[PDB]
Amino acid sequence: CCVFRDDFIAKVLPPVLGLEFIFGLLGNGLALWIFCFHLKSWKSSRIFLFNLAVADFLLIICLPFVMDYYVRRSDWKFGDIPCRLVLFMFAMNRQGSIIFLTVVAVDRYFRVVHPHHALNKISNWTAAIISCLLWGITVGLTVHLLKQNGTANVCISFSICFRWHEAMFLLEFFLPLGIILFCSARIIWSLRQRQMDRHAKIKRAITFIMVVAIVFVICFLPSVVVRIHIFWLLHTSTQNCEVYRSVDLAFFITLSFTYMNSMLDPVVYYFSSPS
Amino acid sequence: RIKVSKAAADLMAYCEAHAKEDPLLTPVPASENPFRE
Amino acid sequence: DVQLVESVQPGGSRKLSCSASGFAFSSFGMHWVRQAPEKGLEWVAYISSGSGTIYYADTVKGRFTISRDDPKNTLFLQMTSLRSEDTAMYYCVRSIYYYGSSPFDFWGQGTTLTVSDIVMTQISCRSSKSLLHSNGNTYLYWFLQRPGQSPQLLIYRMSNLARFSGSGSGTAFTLTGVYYCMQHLEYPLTFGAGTKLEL
Amino acid sequence: EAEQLKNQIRDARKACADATLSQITNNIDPVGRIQMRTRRTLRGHLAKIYAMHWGTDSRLLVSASQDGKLIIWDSYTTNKVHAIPLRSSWVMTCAYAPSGNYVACGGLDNICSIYNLKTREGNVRVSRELAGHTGYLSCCRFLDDNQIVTSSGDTTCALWDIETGQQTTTFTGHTGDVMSLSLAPDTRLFVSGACDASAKLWDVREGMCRQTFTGHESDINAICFFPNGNAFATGSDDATCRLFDLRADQELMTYSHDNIICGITSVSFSKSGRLLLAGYDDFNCNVWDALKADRAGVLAGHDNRVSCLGVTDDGMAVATGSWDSFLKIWN
Amino acid sequence: TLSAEDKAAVERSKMIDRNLREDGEKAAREVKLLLLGAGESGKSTIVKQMTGIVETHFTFKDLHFKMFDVGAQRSERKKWIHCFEGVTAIIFCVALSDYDLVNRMHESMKLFDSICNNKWFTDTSIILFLNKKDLFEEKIKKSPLTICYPEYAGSNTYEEAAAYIQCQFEDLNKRKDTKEIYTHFTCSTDTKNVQFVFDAVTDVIIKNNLKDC
C-alpha cells in the first residue's frame, strides 16, 4: 500500500522487459521449428525437453495484449480479464520451466549413474503421461499461488501492504536447486571415477550439466533473495516505506532475471546437450 | 528344344486368357472389396 | 486325456467347483449350463479367458456369483439365496474363440442339485430373429444329448462338422437322442425345445 | 568333354532362338499406371521380419521375426489367432501347409521345426523336429501334410517325410548356397536359386537335376513360378530381374533400370501373371510389367529394407514384410 | 456392431498382444554378445569361465548375459551376418601361438579386418582377448617373432612383444571416431575376465544411452 509511483528506473524497466521478450520470442521458435521440421525419432529425452519450450512459446503467446500493450502502457490499460490472465501466464511459464529444468537433470542423472535401471528406455506413452501429469501439477500450483479494475495501477496495487506464506515460496525455490546440485556433483564424481574422462562426449555432457545448474541458480536466486529479505525485515519489525520501497525496486529488478532466463534457455540446452 | 517365339506366344495367350480375374489390373469397386475398410 | 470333474434348504447358499485337467485351462472360456430334470437345458453363466467379461442369465442375476481359480485350474460357481425353481442338474462347458475355432466342444460329466431374449422354438427348428450377421457368418449350433451322459456338439454354423449334415438360412435352419439347436448372436443364449428320436 | 558339350548347348540355345517376346509384343498396349493403397497395417512384432506366407484360404498369414515369435494373423480384421514362442530366436524362413493345420519354420539352427495348430488342449505344440542339414536353413515349402522340402546353406536340397523324419530324397549339384526355391503348381517340379548365379530344375519323384539355367552374374535371392507353370522369374542381388522359360531352357528377357542399384530380395507374380512384383533394398517394392519391362508403379511406404513378399491365392491382395517390424496388406 | 464370437476373438487378440508386449520388454533388459575366433583360439576357455548356433547363459552382478558362438557355421558369412546387427558387443579371441604355426596370425587379422570394417558392424564395440599368455612367453623365450613380423620384430621380451601385437591388431580399425577396441590379456582365469567384460559392457551402455539424448 506504498506504491512507489517513481519512474527513475520504472520508466526504463519496460524497455528491458520488452527487449528480453523480443529476444526470447525468437530463438526458441527456431528451436521448435527445427524439432518439428527435423529430428523425428521422438525419444524420451526429446519428449521431455520439448515440454520446456511448450512453456517458452506460451509466454510469447501473450503478445496480443502485449501488442495491445505496445499500444497500451499507461495508455489504454483496460485492467480486466487480460490483466488477470497475463500474470497467470507468467506464473505458469515460470513453474513449468523450473519443473522441467529439474526433470531434465534428473533424467541425465539416471542416464549416467545407473545405466541399467528400468527408469531408462521408457515408452513414449509413459513419457507423455508423466509430461501431462507434470503440467497438471504446475497449473495446480499456479492457481494456488494466484490465490485490477483501476488499470495497471490497481493491477500493481498488490505490492506489499504474509505469515506462513513465504515458507511455501522458500520450499518451492530450494528443493530444485539442491536436486540439481547433488545430481550434477554425483554425475561428475562418478564419471571421473571411471577412467573415461579422456573422451569428448562425456566432457560435453559435464559441461552441459554444469551449465544447467549455472543458468538455474543465476536466474532463480534473486527472487529468493528478495523474498528472504522482506521476510527478515518484517520479522524484525507500521510502514517505514523507504525500507519497503527498496524491496519493491528489487522485486521489479528481479522480474527481469526470470524472464531473461526464460530467454537464454535456447543457447545452453538445445546447443550444449546434443554431443 | 522348343521354339522361343511360339513359347512366348503361348505365354501371352495364357496371360491375356484370364486377364480380368485378378483385381490387380482392374481396380475392383469397393462394394465387393474385402479390404474395403 | 481331456475331462471335466465337478462336484439345499431354500434360501441358503452353496458353492459349485469345476475341476479341469488335461488341457490348457487358462486359455479357455468357461461356461455353465443348467440342465433341467425334464425341461431341457438353459444357459446360466460364462467366464471369458483371463477372468475378463462375465455374463449371467437374467433369472439368476446378482444372486449368483461365478469365478475361476486359474493357478488351481478350478471354476467356482457360488450360489446365494437359492429358490425352489433351482433344482436341476448342472453342466460344465468349455469354449475357445478364434477364427475357425469350435466353441462348446467339450462338456463336463455333470453334477446334480436339489432343493433380446429371442425365441428358439423347435429335423428343423425355427427362430424369432434371423441369425445372419453382416460378416457372412450364421451362428447356429446343433447339439445331441444321448441318454446316459453329457451332450456333445455336432454341427456349428450349420456347415462345419465337429454322415451327419446340416443346412438352412436366416430364421429357417434344419439338420438332416434328444436334439438341441443353439443360437449365439446375442449374449443371452437360448436352448432349443428338444426333439426326441427313438426306435 | 565338358567344354565341347557346353559349346553345343550354347549353340543350340542360340539356334533355337530368333527373337525375344518384345518384338512380338510391340503392339500390346501397356497396362498403364497402377494405384495401390495400404489397406491394412499389421503390427506387433519387435524385431526384423524375415518371412511371411499366405494361407490357403487367402485370409490367414504367418510371419517370422528375430524375436523368437511366430504370429498368425486374420488379415480381414488384423487379429492374432496364435503367437507361437520359438525355441531358437534365429529364424529366416516360414511356411504354411495347404491343409491349414501345420506351419514350418527354420533358421540358423539347421532344424526345420514343424508345429501343429489344431490340438486337443488348444495350444500349439511342436509336432516334429527335422534335422540332417549341415548348413543354415534358407527356405521350406509344403507339398502335403506329410512331405516337406528344405534348402540350406550346405548347397543341398532334400525332401523329407515328416512322419519319419528321414531324407527320402536328396538333391545335389549346386556349387553355392541355396537361397530360395519355388514349387510348381502341379507339385511335380521345383526350381532353386543358389549363390552360383544358376538355377536348377528338379523332379520331386525321381530326384535329379532336370535342367540348369544361367545368365545371372551374382547371387540369386528370390525365385517364383509363373501361374502357367512353364516359366519362372528370378531376382539377383545386383538390381537385375530376369525371366526364364523352363521348356525353352533359355532366358526370355530381363527387368533392369539405370536408377536402381540395390539387390532384389523377393519376386512374385500376379494371378494372371501380367504383373511381376519385386522387392528391393531401396525400402520400396517396384512392380514391373511382365511383357513391357516398364515400372507401372511402386509400393513405397516402408522405412527399411523389404524382406518378404507374397500374393494371395485368389489374386486379390499383396502382402509385404520389412525390417521395420511391420506388415502391410496392399490392394 | 460385432457378434459375440468377434468380440471374444478381439479380447483374445488383446491378451496375446499384452503377453508379447510384456515378453519383449522383459527380453530387452539383457546384453547379447557375439563370439568369434580363428578356430581353436581359446574360446573353450572363455565359455569354460561360466548343430549350428550355440548359445550360453550366465548371470553376473544381477545382470543376465547372453553369448552366441557361431564357429560351427561353414556357410558364407555375408548370407547371415546381417542378422546380427543388434548385438551390444562382439567378442574376438586370438591365440599367441600362430606366429610360428603354419602363419595363422595373418588369417586371424584378415578375419578381424573383415569383421571390424564390415558395414553392418559400424556402431558396435569389439572386445578382443589374447589367449595363451604364458605359452606366448615360453614361445618368445624359445624363438623370436620375426616369422610373423619380419619388419620390426623388436626385442625378445614380454613388454615389447605384448604391446607390439596389440598396436597392430587395433591398427586395422578405420572408424576410429565411432567404434572402440577394448583389449585384455588372458590371465590365469582367476575370475577376472568376466569383470572386464562387465566393465566394457557398462561403458558401451553408457555411450549408447548418451547417444540418443
Q: Which residues contact D291 (CB under 8 A, 6 or more apart)?
A: B12, B15, D21, D25, D28, D274
Q: Are residues C101 and C142 in the same domain?
A: no
Q: Do D135 and E51 touch (CB under 8 A)?
A: no
Which value, to the nearest 10 degrees, does the dihedral of the CA atoms of residues B6, B12, B17, B21 take?
150
**Spatial distance between the Cα atoms of C155 and C138, rounded to a whole number of angstroms:** 12
Spacing of C-alpha C62 from chain mean position: 20
Question: Collapsing DSSP states into helix, strand and coil, what is residue D53?
Answer: strand
Contacts of C135 in chain E (CB under 8 A): 3, 6
Q: C-alpha distances in angstroms, D174 versus A269, D137, D150, E171, E184?
A: 60, 15, 14, 39, 43
Fold for E31-212, please state it: Rossmann fold (3.40.50)
A91 C-beta neighbours (distance < 10 Å), count: 18
Q: How far apart are CA A218 and CA A211, in angstroms?
A: 10
Torsion sign (Cα): C36, C37, C39, C41: positive
Burial class (CB in 10 A: 0-12, 13-18, 19+), A249: middle
Grid-cell match 515378453, residue found: E23
Contact A232, A244 (CB under 8 A): no
Neighbours of C182 (CB within 10 A): 21
- D83: contact with C, CB 8 A cutoff: no
- Which residue type sits at A255? L
E11 Cβ under 8 Å from any chain C Cβ: yes
C-alpha cell at D105: 519354420
Instruction: List the Cα angle E129/E134/E140 in 5-degree steps.
Output: 100
Nine-digit cell string for B4: 522361343
CB pairs under 8 A between D and E: 72
Contacts of E202 in chain A (CB under 8 A): 115-116
- Burial code (b: 16+ CB inside 10 Å, e: under 16) for C184-199 equals bbeebbbbbebeeeee
Output B14-18 pairs: Cβ under 8 A, ≥24 positions apart.
B14/D227, B14/D228, B14/D273, B15/D272, B15/D273, B15/D274, B15/D290, B15/D291, B18/D271, B18/D272
Same domain, C8 and C103: yes
CA A234 to chain centre: 27
The single-letter code of the amino acid at D100 is G
Supply angle C-alpha D281, D285, D286, rounded to 5: 115
Q: Cell numbers 527513475 label which residue?
A: A8
Nearest CB to C98; choose among E3, E4, E12: E12
Task: Give dist(CA B4, CA D209) in Å, integer.
Answer: 22
Whole-angstrom Cα distance, residue E187 to residue E132?
A: 9
The DSSP element (H or E) to which D117 belongs, if any, is none
Q: Would you call D178 helix, strand, or coil by DSSP?
A: strand
D271: nearest CB among B1, B22, B35: B22
> Comparing C-alpha atoms, which of E66, E81, E158, E147 is closest to residue E114?
E81
Cα(C129)–Cα(C136) distance, integer angstroms: 16
- Kindly report the CATH number assigned to the domain that includes residue C174: 2.60.40.10
Residue A250, helix vs strand vs coil: helix
Q: Which residues of B touch D245 (CB under 8 A)?
A: 4, 7-8, 11
Q: Which residue has the cell 546437450?
A: A273
Helices (H), chain E: 4-27, 43-49, 77-80, 104-116, 133-142, 158-171, 193-212
Chains that touch D (3 or more CB pairs under 8 A): B, C, E
Which residue reads 508379447 in cell numbers? E20
C-alpha cell read off for D27: 503392339
Q: Does C31 share its domain with C84?
A: yes
| Mutation for testing the E interface, residue in D79, D124, D238, D322 having most E CBs under 10 Å | D79
The set of cell numbers assigned to C35 is 440342465
Distances from the Cα of E23 to the Cαs of D46, D82, D224, in angstroms?
10, 15, 36
Number of C-beta neighbours around residue E155 at 10 A:
10
> Does residue D311 contact residue D297 with C-beta atoms inside 8 Å?
no
**Which residues of B make CB contacts under 8 Å with D?**
1-5, 7-12, 14-15, 18-25, 27, 33-36
D38 CB within 8 Å of a chain B CB = no
Contacts for A185-193: CB closer than 8 Å, 24+ residues apart:
A186/A109, A186/A113, A187/A108, A187/A109, A187/A112, A187/A113, A190/A112, A190/A113, A191/A112
Partner B contacted by D18 (CB < 8 A): yes
Residue C88 included in any domain: yes
**Using CA atoms, how far apart are residues D145 and D128, in angstroms rounded to an integer?**
12
List of chain D residues whose C-beta atoms are within 8 Å of the C-beta of residue C96: 122
Do the beta carbons of residue A45 and residue A107 sit within 8 Å?
Answer: yes
C-alpha cell at D28: 500390346
- A245 reaches E (C-beta below 8 A): no
Q: Tell me the nearest-neighbour CA distance from C102 into chain D, angstroms.
A: 10
**Chains contacting A (3+ CB pairs below 8 angstroms):** E
> Same domain, yes or no, for C104 and C128?
no
Cβ distance of A111 and E63 shorter than 8 Å = no
C128 shares a domain with C91: no
Beta bridge partners of D157: D151, D171
- List all residues 6 or more positions away from B13 whose beta carbon is below 8 Å from its beta carbon: none
Q: Put the strands of the sheet holding C195-196 in their side by side order.
A: C160-161, C152-156, C140-145, C178-183, C195-196
Identify the sign of the CA torsion A127, A131, A132, A133: positive
d(CA C161, CA C155): 5
Q: Concatenated DSSP letters for A179-233? A: HHHHHHHHHHHHHHTTT-TTSSHHHHHHHHHHHHHHHHHHHHHHHHHHHHHHHHH
Whole-angstrom CA distances from A163 to A58, A166, A168, D306, E132 are 32, 7, 10, 69, 77
Distance from CA of C189 to the nearest CA of D (A): 24
Q: How far apart, in Å, are the Cα atoms of D228 and each of A152, B13, B22?
A: 87, 10, 15
Q: How far is CA D60 from CA A116, C160, D77, D82, D117, in A?
A: 40, 18, 10, 11, 13
Quote the CA–CA distance of C142 and C181 in Å, as a whole number: 4
> What's the rounded Cα separation, in Å, for the pair C183 and C142?
9
Per CB-CB distance under 8 Å, the chain D contacts of C1 are 120
Looking only at the bridges linking them, the beta strands covering E181-185 and E125-130 are: parallel
Q: Supply the range of the domain harboring residue D228.
A: 1-330
Residue D317 to residue B12, Cβ atoms within 8 A: no
In a domain, residue C105? The reply is yes
Determine if residue A117 is left, alpha or beta; phi over 0 gives left, psi from -120 to 50 gives alpha, anything else beta: beta
Spatial distance between the Cα atoms of C170 and C129, rounded to a whole number of angstroms: 8
* Amino acid, res. B20: K
The overall longest dimension of chain C from CA atoms, in Å, is: 49
Question: Is residue C168 packed enough to be buried (19+ CB in 10 Å), middle (13-18) or exposed (0-12)?
Answer: buried
A118 in reach of chain E (CB within 8 A): yes
Is residue E101 within 8 Å of residue E67, measured between CB atoms? no
Q: Which of A104, A116, A125, A272 to mutate to test the interface with E (most CBs of E within 10 A)?
A: A116
Is C119 among the domain residues? no
* Euclidean distance between CA atoms E10 and E63, whole angstroms: 37
Contact E15 C49 (CB under 8 A): yes
Burial class (CB in 10 A: 0-12, 13-18, 19+), C103: buried
> Are the C-beta atoms of A211 and A261 separated by less than 8 Å?
no
C49 in reach of chain E (CB within 8 A): yes
SS3 D254: strand
Q: Which of C63, C66, C61 is nearest to C51 (CA)?
A: C66
User: All 3 cell numbers of residue E195?
Assistant: 569383470
End-to-end CA distance of chain D: 53
Chain B residues touching residue D40 (CB < 8 angstroms): 35
- What are the chain E neighbours of D218 within 8 Å (beta carbons)? none
Terminal CA-to-CA distance of chain E, rounded, Å?
45
- Cβ separation C139–E11 shorter than 8 A: no
- What's D258's domain CATH number? 2.130.10.10
> In total, how many domains does chain D have?
1
Q: For residues C64 and C47, is the Cβ–Cβ distance under 8 A?
A: no
Mark yes or no for CB contact A112/E213 under 8 Å. no
Resolution in angstrom units: 3.4
Q: Which chains does chain B touch, 3 or more C-beta pairs < 8 A?
A: D
Strand partners, E129: E184
Both C106 and C170 in one domain: the answer is no
Please tell me the distance from the alpha carbon of residue A52 to that of residue A46, in angstroms, as a whole number.
10
The Cα–Cα gap between D220 and D217 comes to 9
Helix (H, G, I), strand (E, B) or coil at A236: helix
Strand order in the sheet with D157-161: D137-142, D147-152, D157-161, D166-171
Q: Which residue of chain E comes nearest to A42, CA vs CA? A: E212
CA distances from A21 to A25, A155, A204 (A): 6, 20, 29
Total Cβ atoms within 10 A of residue D205: 8
E8/C50 touch (CB, cutoff 8 Å), yes or no: no
Tally of domains in chain C: 2
Which CATH fold topology does A13-272 show?
Answer: Rhopdopsin 7-helix transmembrane proteins (1.20.1070)
**Cell 432343493 sits on residue:** C115
Residues in A 254-273 with any Cβ partner in E closer than 8 A: 273
Q: How many CB pairs under 8 A join A and E?
A: 36
Distance, in angstroms, between E18 CA and closest chain C CA?
12
Q: List the end-to-end C-alpha distance of chain B, in Å, as a whole number.
A: 50
Domain that holds residue C73: 3-113
Q: Do chains B and C touch (3 or more CB pairs under 8 A)?
A: no
Backbone φ and ψ of E29, nearest 5° = -95, 55
Do C70 and C104 lie in a common domain?
yes
Show the cell assigned to A264.
537464454
Cα–Cα distance between D307 and D313 in angstroms, integer?
Answer: 20
For residues C103 and C188, membership in a common domain is answered with no
Does C102 share its domain with C143? no
Q: Does E9 touch chain C (CB under 8 A)?
A: yes
Handedness of CA D219, D225, D230, D233 (dihedral sign): negative
The secondary structure element, H or E, covering residue B7 is helix B4-18
* CA dist., res. D320 & res. D54, Å (int): 11
DSSP string, chain C: --EEEE---TT--EEEEEEEESS-GGGSEEEEEEE-SSS-EEEEEEE-TTS--EEE-GGGTTTEEEEEETTTTEEEEEE-S--STT-EEEEEEEE--STT--TT-EE---EEE----------EEE-SS--B-TTS-B-EEEEEE-TTS--EEEEETTTEE----EEEETTEEEE--EEEEEE-SSSS------EE---
Cell numbers 530326384 correspond to: D207
State in Å, rounded, how far the first CA of chain C is from the last one. 33
Burial D55-75 (b: 16+ CB within 10 A, else e): beebbbbbbbbbbbbbbbbbb
Q: Name which of D16, D272, D318 is nearest B15 (Cβ-Cβ).
A: D272
Helix H segments across chain A? 13-37, 44-60, 63-71, 81-112, 124-146, 151-155, 165-192, 201-236, 241-265, 271-272
CA geometry: angle at C167 spanning C163 and C169, to 5°? 175
